[PDB]
Amino acid sequence: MQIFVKTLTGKTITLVVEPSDTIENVKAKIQDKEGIPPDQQRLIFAGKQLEDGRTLSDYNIQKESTLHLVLRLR
Ligand SMILES: [Zn+2]
Ligand SMILES: [Zn+2]
Ligand SMILES: [Zn+2]
Numbered sequence: 001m002q003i004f005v006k007t008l009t010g011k012t013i014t015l016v017v018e019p020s021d022t023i024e025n026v027k028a029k030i031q032d033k034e035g036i037p038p039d040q041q042r043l044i045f046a047g048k049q050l051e052d053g054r055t056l057s058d059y060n061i062q063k064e065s066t067l068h069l070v071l072r073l074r
């Protein structure tokens with residue numbers, strides 16, 4: 001299972017994941033790929049704000065889904 005994360009510049013990160021992976025896990029994988037601190041990362045899928053402790057399957061993120069990194073505002 002893979003997902004795509006688009007960064008704020010539109011760069012695509014491809015990640016190997018499993019349904020149960022937490023969003024926290026995903027943030028760690030993005031840190032490794034791009035050096036973006038997890039505390040600076042805000043993810044959305046299908047307009048939904050994704051919380052660190054919930055899983056990809058909790059959000060119905062599927063094979064080949066795209067997530068966006070969006071502005072950390074405050
Ligand atoms: Zn496993
Ligand atoms: Zn995992
Ligand atoms: Zn695992």
Ligand SMILES: [Zn+2]
Pocket residue numbers: 037039040
């Ligand atoms: Zn920090």
Ligand SMILES: [Zn+2]
Pocket residue numbers: 066068
């Ligand atoms: Zn999009």
